[PDB]
Amino acid sequence: AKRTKKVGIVGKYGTRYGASLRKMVKKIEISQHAKYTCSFCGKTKMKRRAVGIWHCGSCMKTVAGGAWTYNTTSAVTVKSAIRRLKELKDQ
Amino acid sequence: HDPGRGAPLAKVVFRDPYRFKKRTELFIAAEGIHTGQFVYCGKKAQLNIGNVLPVGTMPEGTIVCCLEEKPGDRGKLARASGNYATVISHNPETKKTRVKLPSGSKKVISSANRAVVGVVAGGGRIDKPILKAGRAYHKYKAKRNCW
Amino acid sequence: RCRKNTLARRKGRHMGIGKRKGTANARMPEKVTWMRRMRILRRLLRRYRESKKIDRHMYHSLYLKVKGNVFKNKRILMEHIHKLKADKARKKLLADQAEARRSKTKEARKRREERLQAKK
Amino acid sequence: PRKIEEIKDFLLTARRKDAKSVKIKKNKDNVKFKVRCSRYLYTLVITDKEKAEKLKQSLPPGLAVKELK
Amino acid sequence: VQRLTYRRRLSYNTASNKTRLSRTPGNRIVYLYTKKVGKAPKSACGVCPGRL
RNA sequence: GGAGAAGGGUUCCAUGUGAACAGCAGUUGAACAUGGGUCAGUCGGUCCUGAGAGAUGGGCGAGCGCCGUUCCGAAGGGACGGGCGAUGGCCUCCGUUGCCCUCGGCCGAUCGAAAGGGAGUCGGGUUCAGAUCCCCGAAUCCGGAGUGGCGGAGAUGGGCGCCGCGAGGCGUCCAGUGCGGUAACGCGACCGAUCCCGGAGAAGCCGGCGGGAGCCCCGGGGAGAGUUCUCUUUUCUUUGUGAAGGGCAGGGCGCCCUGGAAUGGGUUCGCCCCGAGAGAGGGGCCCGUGCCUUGGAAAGCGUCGCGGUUCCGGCGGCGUCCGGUGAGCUCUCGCUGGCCCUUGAAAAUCCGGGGGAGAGGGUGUAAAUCUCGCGCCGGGCCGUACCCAUAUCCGCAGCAGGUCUCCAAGGUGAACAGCCUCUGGCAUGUUGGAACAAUGUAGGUAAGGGAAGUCGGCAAGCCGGAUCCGUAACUUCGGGAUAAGGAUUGGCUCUAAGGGCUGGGUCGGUCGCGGCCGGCGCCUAGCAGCCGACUUAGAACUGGUGCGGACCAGGGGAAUCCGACUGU
RNA sequence: AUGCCUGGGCAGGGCGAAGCCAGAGGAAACUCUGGUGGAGGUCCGUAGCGGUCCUGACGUGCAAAUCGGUCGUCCGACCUG
Ligand SMILES: [Mg+2]
Ligand SMILES: [Mg+2]
Ligand SMILES: [Mg+2]
Ligand SMILES: [Mg+2]
Ligand SMILES: [Mg+2]
Ligand SMILES: [Mg+2]
Ligand SMILES: [Mg+2]
Ligand SMILES: [Mg+2]
Ligand SMILES: [Mg+2]
Ligand SMILES: [Mg+2]
Ligand SMILES: [Mg+2]
Ligand SMILES: [Mg+2]
Ligand SMILES: [Mg+2]
Ligand SMILES: [Mg+2]
Ligand SMILES: [Mg+2]
Ligand SMILES: [Mg+2]
Ligand SMILES: [Mg+2]
Ligand SMILES: [Zn+2]
């Protein structure tokens, strides 16, 4: 609450588009423009390049992830279920 | 990134086991697929994400993407941005398999047709509001003259 | 004519309140002033660091303080560095005196221990 | 063009079959010895006047040694 | 101050119509058309962003 | 103002006439009549493909034809290596053609951009009108090169047995498709096919910073010059070098070697980086459009003086010099970020790499040179004048309309705003003279009242820049907001604050003011000298209260209805 | 009029979103102050694009739709070959 009270990133939109829409898009913007930690090099340089495309500055590795977040909950659940099914099948 | 398509694509290079050459295919990237990763395809392929294998081999409850509607059509179902199909049951007789489409319908398909394990990468696009006529214009400029 | 007017402006003429049409930032942007100030202060700081006037830690602290616009010009920074060096010298002198006293006491105690061992 | 630092290379160039009119420029301590060839105009720079005068007559075949003025 | 013109019939400032200023022995500024900037070859590995 | 694209098509240049046209005139013209004028391997078409168009195969259709561009095709007529046969040329040696074996993906014939991709030329001079095209002088690209025109690289190593004092000579065995550096990589070359891999070509918009150049600015030297009734070491103009090579500054590196860091450090305007190797040292690579040099002072320019009645592209003396600055403008190069539910071209063409199918002569030679330096020959066809717009184009016309771009000085000023000026351009826009009646069109000023006018404050006027204060209801908390409302603004003379570069290693010894050696002072509270851009604040004095003095330049507040807004 | 391909262009200022630095308070959660930063289908405004009002000029006109002042927008659903 240094410069703005309760808008933060959506301060660029001004008074337009409605309060609820700006509040809804605030979390999406924060997740989209956040830099994540790459689980290949250990550095916090994972940045979103395009929709579902995440790139590491150091590793130079591109990872196919979510649209606005590096990992979606559905993808993690599917990965866990696939690992469980593989362990049940191959044994 | 393919213009007009939310889901990202992945370039995978194989080697043709008939001539000395490197074949290249353009698959639909699944969640968790990264560069410099080995991806396998075949009847004996293991059950990992981004690994295409026939639905008959895969056990029930498996989440798949780019499912083949017919055996050999090279992927037609559940391939938009984050959609996926789920295998429900297998029928050893008559070589049939039941799959649930993202629309909620259940369809019977042959067990020979293949599918890619996992969900399509880039899901959750529809959550973010467009907030502008300009962003809608830019979105539809790469698809059609229909906005 | 314009050369004479420019000389008058150099001494300072026709530059009052009633002969300025642009804003203060338009006439002289604040970003350029900050850039010049930062470059001058950092240049002096690394001159002092390269001349062994200050060590690595004082240089880093003063660099972070310069980035926080603590010092408005070169003279203020120089005087603050003088005060820091004086305080550090006083603290180091007291610490050196204490260390010498502790070393003397420990050596005397060790000498007495050796004497006790020798006498048995 | 190409500049030559050694007088022997200049003499070798001046005796080429494709050599042409060789002009001498008296540039007031910047004496030049220019040999016209098929591709390049090789120039020799001699700072000494006596060396230039000695090298003036060194041309074997007697080309167009016409001086520049 | 001398002002100069294009020396060719292409008047549009396109990629192929890039020039630079040069001073001739005639003591006049003219336009010299420059070649495009080349690029070093990139590594065949495709992971290194720098050029060879 | 100087040049182009589309379009125009002789309107361009010289001479002549004034019949007709240029809404007056004309000795003038874009009118009329005679002639003249457009010079290319390097500037573009030509080559490539894009959006797309369009044959064959195939299908349809009564039919002219249509559908479709890979789809219901025996779709490549090419190539290397080997064999045979034939001719030609000193049938030695090679070329050509025919046959046989062998090898072979492409992806649809073809067209499609004078602003996309696309190797390679500049300087001076020159016409009445053309010149990166003509002449002069310097280069460069592509193709050919057989008999290879030359040199150079594959190159002239060792061992053994002899001869000779030795240099060296003879015979024999072989090696020899290069060399250097730990490394990045470098050296003028430095065999190689079918095949495979990769790169370049080949990429969006915006912000910030840094380097280089052009222009502008300041302090001077010259040369020519306006003023000089008073002053002004005066003000005005000029004061340089091409492409292509070599060398060196200057930038960038996500390149390498030593080493391992918390007392975390380095560092930018911002960022950012570091045990997946940061600071500190030593190297390497890329761009070098910048500086020196060949080109190149011979030429160009400014001056002063002449040859020649004339023609005459001439002859000569001089100079073309030394420095500093700037969030300054433009171009370009390079880093660094921000935005996309937007990710921002294809092909022609060129190159590098992985392999070793094959070749070579055998110990002085050869096969090879993605040819190392020179040397020889050729580059065909088309366009090239001029206007490019208040008169060469489209609007019936020399029509206040419309029509795509590049170059961009000084002052004031935030400014590419408005106003004045320099280089350059012109005659006021299809005519002039004489008066200043009414109505007009376009500007203004008006005592007192201040919307009483009118459907309606229509029109006009009021406010307006900058600095210092202050700023309400409401609210989606982002705004409202320059809310509203106040004070100042000139000129002159000062004061204060905001920076860079260099300098001490002084003493003694030694060597030729400088270099080396040892301990000293280590300015570690820093000072001395020399330079330079503009600013901010304060103070005094002063003018008939004038001062954003011209120009630029928001009138506000309280409410109702509608549409969220931006946009059409 | 619309879609696609290939090119070109858009002075000078105001407001000040993320992110970052320094200081102060706190037991923590964290909160204030001063800076840096330059985002916005943001604002004033020129070129460009368009055409609200004067229902001005003209209305056998410059013009079979032009002209003057005043205007809307002017980094994006922008303008243009
Ligand atoms: Mg072109
Ligand atoms: Mg003109
Ligand atoms: Mg004429
Ligand atoms: Mg007439
Ligand atoms: Mg074509
Ligand atoms: Mg380092
Ligand atoms: Mg012309
Ligand atoms: Mg006219
Ligand atoms: Mg008039
Ligand atoms: Mg007139
Ligand atoms: Mg009145
Ligand atoms: Mg009004
Ligand atoms: Mg209000
Ligand atoms: Mg109501
Ligand atoms: Mg509306
Ligand atoms: Mg009217
Ligand atoms: Mg009338
Ligand atoms: Zn990583």
CSV table of N, CA and C (backbone and C1' of nucleotides) and ligand atoms in Angstrom, one decimal, chain A residues 37-46 55-61, chain F residues 276, ligand 18:
chain,number,residue,atom,x,y,z
A,37,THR,N,10.6,-20.3,-10.3
A,37,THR,CA,11.9,-21.0,-10.1
A,37,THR,C,11.9,-22.2,-11.0
A,38,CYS,N,13.0,-22.2,-11.8
A,38,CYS,CA,13.1,-23.3,-12.8
A,38,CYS,C,13.6,-24.6,-12.0
A,39,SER,N,12.9,-25.7,-12.1
A,39,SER,CA,13.3,-26.9,-11.5
A,39,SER,C,14.2,-27.8,-12.5
A,40,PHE,N,15.1,-27.1,-13.1
A,40,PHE,CA,16.2,-27.7,-13.8
A,40,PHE,C,17.6,-27.1,-13.5
A,41,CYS,N,17.6,-25.8,-13.2
A,41,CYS,CA,18.8,-25.1,-12.8
A,41,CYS,C,18.8,-24.6,-11.4
A,42,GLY,N,17.6,-24.4,-10.8
A,42,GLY,CA,17.5,-23.9,-9.4
A,42,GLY,C,17.5,-22.4,-9.4
A,43,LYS,N,17.4,-21.7,-10.5
A,43,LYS,CA,17.3,-20.2,-10.5
A,43,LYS,C,15.9,-19.7,-10.8
A,44,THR,N,15.6,-18.6,-10.3
A,44,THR,CA,14.3,-18.0,-10.4
A,44,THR,C,14.2,-17.1,-11.7
A,45,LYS,N,14.2,-17.8,-12.8
A,45,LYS,CA,14.2,-17.2,-14.1
A,45,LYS,C,13.1,-17.8,-15.1
A,46,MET,N,12.2,-18.6,-14.6
A,46,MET,CA,11.2,-19.1,-15.5
A,46,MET,C,10.2,-18.0,-15.8
A,55,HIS,N,9.8,-20.3,-20.5
A,55,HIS,CA,11.2,-20.4,-20.9
A,55,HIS,C,12.1,-20.0,-19.8
A,56,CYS,N,13.2,-20.7,-19.7
A,56,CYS,CA,14.3,-20.4,-18.7
A,56,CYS,C,15.4,-19.6,-19.3
A,57,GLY,N,15.8,-18.5,-18.7
A,57,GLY,CA,16.9,-17.7,-19.2
A,57,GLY,C,18.2,-18.4,-19.1
A,58,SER,N,18.4,-19.2,-18.1
A,58,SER,CA,19.7,-19.9,-17.9
A,58,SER,C,19.8,-21.2,-18.6
A,59,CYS,N,18.8,-22.1,-18.3
A,59,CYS,CA,18.8,-23.4,-18.9
A,59,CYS,C,18.5,-23.4,-20.4
A,60,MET,N,17.8,-22.3,-20.9
A,60,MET,CA,17.4,-22.2,-22.3
A,60,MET,C,16.4,-23.3,-22.6
A,61,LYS,N,15.6,-23.8,-21.6
A,61,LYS,CA,14.7,-24.8,-21.8
A,61,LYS,C,13.3,-24.3,-21.8
F,276,A,P,27.9,-25.9,-8.9
F,276,A,O5',27.6,-25.2,-10.3
F,276,A,C5',28.6,-25.0,-11.3
F,276,A,C4',28.1,-24.5,-12.6
F,276,A,C3',27.5,-23.1,-12.6
F,276,A,O3',27.7,-22.5,-13.9
F,276,A,C1',25.8,-24.6,-13.1
H,18,ZN,ZN,16.7,-23.3,-15.5
